[PDB]
């Protein structure tokens, strides 16, 4: 990959090898009585261990042989897609003592990285979960605990990335694998930042004494735009690295308040913001969204902001009638339109985009074949019925 002179065009492989409950809502509610949520697995953790390893592992082996396949591939491909970014947890490599966690999910990732060979897709491996979990969200695999920098739990990490460097950064899959991403979201207002540092250090350091020249990327870790200007540099003979950052306008109160101008200039301004800053960087995740009314979203057992119903967010409006494409406004299929590709402006401005996710089992915002198939996400990808919002030069 030439990172000066390509464009990624990518989705995510999301709640493939990590569940997500707001992603495939139906291994969650079973669990359900009623309209109770209470007794509702709130993650990975409490999910595999709730039904204990022989359940988990029966029904998690149906879920990796279906929920993404080679036809997958196959149409990613042809709808001009170049790229996808597959998230993973340590717990497919490593279990600590007495983890709940089930394994097999390698000898999918390695029939993905051939099935991405044959199509002419190439891939970062996201390093996704980290034990004791680097950001409290059920995406880590481990709601509500940022344990990431205590005990051992960064050596295990590290360890667990060896593994990685070793199988998937060497010459086997040099034309497949464009990026190692160290760690996904790690959640730098609780964290320790001068500690995260020297994990990231201590990543790239020990990838590179393999004698991998596999791109690192970081995460911004939730930092302002340009805070890693100056870390891992080329004037230091630190190379090939990128930084991933992640885009959205949903989760809090004033952002959900925007009307559909003020969505657009912030959009712009990711675009602006990141052509300053002196690392190659990707838009790693971003969607459709414009509101956080997917189930499940905010969390097992949490509502929406939207309508009022968490975060203390006054009400906006009701999640009901956007629950369905089909009932969709045309004002906000418009609105869903022109946000969509003031993002694709902005994130081919600079590295790229990676759009969060492929698929969702009924949650239309956060799913590119739903917005595909609709005729609100460009096909092809450079087609602009809005053209021109931002005026990049």
Same mark, same amino acid.
């Given at each position: ?45 409490? %999910?595999?261990? *709730? ?10 082996? +149906?879920?990796?042989? !279906? ?22 947890? #340590? %717990? ?12 097999? /999910?390698?000898? #999918?990732?390695? +029939?993905?990285?051939? %099935? ?8 970062w491996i996201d390093l996704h979960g980290a034990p004791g979990s680097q950001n409290g969200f059920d995406n880590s695999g481990l709601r509500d605990s940022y344990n990431f920098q205590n005990g051992?739990? *960064?050596?295990? !990490? ?50 590179? /004494? ?69 690392? %190659? ?52 299929? *418009?609105? =869903?339109?022109? #946000? ?31 917005? =595909? ?15 021109? /919002?931002?005026?990049?030069?």
């Amino acid at each position: 990959w030439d990172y000066d002179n390509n464009v990624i065009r990518g989705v995510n492989l999301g709640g493939w090898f990590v569940l997500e409950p707001y992603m495939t809502p139906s291994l969650f509610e079973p669990f359900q009585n009623g309209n109770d949520q209470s007794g509702v697995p709130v993650d990975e953790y409490h %999910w595999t261990q *709730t039904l204990g390893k022989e359940a988990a592992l029966r029904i998690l082996q +149906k879920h990796w042989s !279906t929920w993404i396949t080679e036809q997958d591939f196959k149409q990613i491909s042809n709808l001009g897609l170049n790229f996808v970014r597959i998230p993973i947890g #340590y %717990w497919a490599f490593q279990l600590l003592d007495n983890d709940p966690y089930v394994q097999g /999910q390698v000898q #999918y990732l390695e +029939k993905a990285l051939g %099935w991405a060979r044959k199509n002419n897709i190439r891939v970062w491996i996201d390093l996704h979960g980290a034990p004791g979990s680097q950001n409290g969200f059920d995406n880590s695999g481990l709601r509500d605990s940022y344990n990431f920098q205590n005990g051992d739990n *960064t050596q295990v !990490t590290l360890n667990v990335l060896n593994t990685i460097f070793k199988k998937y950064g060497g010459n086997e899959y040099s034309d497949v694998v464009i990026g190692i991403e160290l760690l996904n979201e790690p959640l730098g207002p609780v964290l320790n930042m001068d500690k995260l540092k020297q994990f990231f250090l201590d990543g790239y350091n020990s990838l590179r /004494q393999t004698g991998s020249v596999t791109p690192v990327i970081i995460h911004d870790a939730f930092q302002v735009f340009g805070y890693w200007n100056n870390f891992l540099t080329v004037a230091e003979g630190q190379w090939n690295v990128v930084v991933d950052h992640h885009h959205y306008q949903v989760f809090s109160g004033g952002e959900l308040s925007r009307n559909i101008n003020d969505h657009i200039s912030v959009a712009c301004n990711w675009g602006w913001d990141a052509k300053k800053e002196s690392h %190659w960087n990707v838009a790693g995740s971003w969607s459709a969204a414009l509101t956080d009314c997917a189930k499940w979203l905010n969390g097992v057992n949490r509502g929406a902001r939207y309508e009022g119903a968490y975060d203390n967010a006054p009400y906006i409006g009701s999640c009901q009638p956007l629950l369905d494409i089909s009932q969709w406004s045309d004002e906000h299929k *418009t609105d =869903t339109r022109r #946000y969509i590709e003031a993002q694709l402006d902005a994130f081919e401005y600079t590295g790229g985009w990676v759009f969060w996710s492929w698929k969702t089992e009924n949650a239309p915002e956060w799913s590119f074949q739903t917005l =595909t198939y609709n005729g609100l996400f460009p096909q092809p990808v450079t087609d602009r019925q809005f053209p021109n /919002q931002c005026g990049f030069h």
